[PDB]
Write an enzyme that holds these catalytic residues in place. Sequence first.
Site, PDB file in Angstrom:
ATOM      1  N   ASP A 123      -6.830   6.975  28.871  1.00 22.57           N
ATOM      2  CA  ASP A 123      -6.161   6.680  27.557  1.00 22.57           C
ATOM      3  C   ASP A 123      -5.906   5.369  27.321  1.00 22.57           C
ATOM      4  OD1 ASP A 123      -6.454   9.426  26.671  1.00 22.57           O
ATOM      5  OD2 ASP A 123      -4.162   9.573  26.545  1.00 22.57           O
ATOM      6  N   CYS A 136     -17.655   5.992  20.296  1.00 16.62           N
ATOM      7  CA  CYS A 136     -16.568   6.238  20.820  1.00 16.62           C
ATOM      8  C   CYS A 136     -15.561   6.613  19.702  1.00 16.62           C
ATOM      9  CB  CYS A 136     -16.084   5.086  21.775  1.00 16.62           C
ATOM     10  SG  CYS A 136     -16.216   3.315  20.981  1.00 16.62           S
ATOM     11  N   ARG A 191     -15.502   0.727  23.769  1.00 12.43           N
ATOM     12  CA  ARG A 191     -16.473   1.453  24.972  1.00 12.43           C
ATOM     13  C   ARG A 191     -17.987   1.442  24.507  1.00 12.43           C
ATOM     14  NH1 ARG A 191     -12.378   6.807  25.446  1.00 12.43           N
ATOM     15  NH2 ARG A 191     -10.420   5.422  25.506  1.00 12.43           N
ATOM     16  N   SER A 192     -18.421   1.813  23.249  1.00  8.05           N
ATOM     17  CA  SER A 192     -19.744   1.693  23.074  1.00  8.05           C
ATOM     18  C   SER A 192     -20.426   0.232  23.415  1.00  8.05           C
ATOM     19  CB  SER A 192     -19.794   2.030  21.438  1.00  8.05           C
ATOM     20  OG  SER A 192     -19.588   3.402  21.305  1.00  8.05           O
ATOM     21  N   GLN A 226     -13.533  -5.072  22.671  1.00  7.30           N
ATOM     22  CA  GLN A 226     -12.160  -4.900  22.173  1.00  7.30           C
ATOM     23  C   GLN A 226     -11.222  -5.697  22.605  1.00  7.30           C
ATOM     24  OE1 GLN A 226     -12.351  -0.592  20.914  1.00  7.30           O
ATOM     25  NE2 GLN A 226     -11.445  -1.187  19.072  1.00  7.30           N
TER      26      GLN A 226
END
Length: 282
Positions: free
Chosen positions: A181, A215, A221-222, A262
Site C-alpha cells: 500500500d 495501475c 507502477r505501470s 511517480q
Amino acid sequence: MEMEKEFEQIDKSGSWAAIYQDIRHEASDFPSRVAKLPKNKNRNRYRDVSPFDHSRIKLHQEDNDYINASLIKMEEAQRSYILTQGPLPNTVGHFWEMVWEQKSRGVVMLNRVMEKGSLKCAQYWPQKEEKEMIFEDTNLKLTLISEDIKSYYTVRQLELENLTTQETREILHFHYTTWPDFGVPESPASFLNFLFKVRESGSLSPEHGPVVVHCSAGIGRSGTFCLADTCLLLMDKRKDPSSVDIKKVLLEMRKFRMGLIQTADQLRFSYLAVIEGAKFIM
Ligand SMILES: CS(=O)(=O)NCCc1ccccc1
Ligand SMILES: CS(=O)(=O)NCCc1ccccc1
C-alpha cells in the site's frame, strides 16, 4: 556511467531526489486538449494525469472516441505498450472495447481494487465462471474461463466476445497482487518473476497487439513495468549492454505519456530491478 555503479554512487551520496527532479524538469510537455474537454470529465480518474493528443488511443466510435490511454512505441527495442488508468464505473465498457480494437492478448494489472481503504479501480472482470459480464454500451461479453492463484500474482483466462459479429478471443489477465500500500517492494525478485511470466505467455510479442498495462493512474507502477522490460531487452540486443542508460530510456517513454515513475523510490526500484534482472538473463 554504467548502471550498477552509478546506483551505488547515488545511494552513498543520497541524491535520488535530485536525480528524479532532473528527470521531471527535462520531461516532454505536449498538449492534452481532448482529455480536458468538458464532455470527458467523468472519463478521467485524476485531473492531473492525461494522455497527450499525439499518442492517445482512439476508440472506434463516432460519438466520443476518448479514453485515458496512451501508446508507448519503443523503436530500438521493437516493443509497444498501452498504458491506461484503472477503469472507472463509466469506462469499463470503453476499456474492453480498446482491448478488442487494438488486438491485445494480455492485460497487466499492478494494483488491488481496494488499497488504503479506498477504491482504486472498478471490478471490471468476472469473479465466477457462471456469472459473466455484459457491457451494453459497447456490445461485448466477458467470461471467466480459469484462474490460477499464486503467492505473489494471479493469472486468469478470459473469453471476450464481440456480440455484434459473434467473434471470440482469449485474453490473459496478469494480476500482480502484492505491491505494498505504501512505498515499493524491498526486493525486485517477485516483480521480475512476474515480468518473465507475462513474457513467456506471448502477450508482449509482435504477433499480437500491444499489451494493456494499468495501475490506478497508469503512470507509476505501470511505468516501472515497461521501463524494466525495455531496458532488459536493449541489454540483450546491443553489443555493449553497459551502454543502456535507464534515465534516457525513461525520458524517451515520457515523450508518449506524462509522469511515468511517480517517486524517487520508484526510480531507485526500477534501477534495482534492471540490475538484478540482467544477472538472471545470463
Ligand atoms: C451487469 S454485468 O455484471 O454483466 N456488467 C456490468 C459492467 C460493470 C462492471 C463493474 C462496474 C461497473 C460496471
Ligand atoms: C478450457 S476451455 O476449453 O474453455 N478453453 C478454450 C480456450 C479459450 C480460453 C480462453 C478464451 C478463449 C478460448
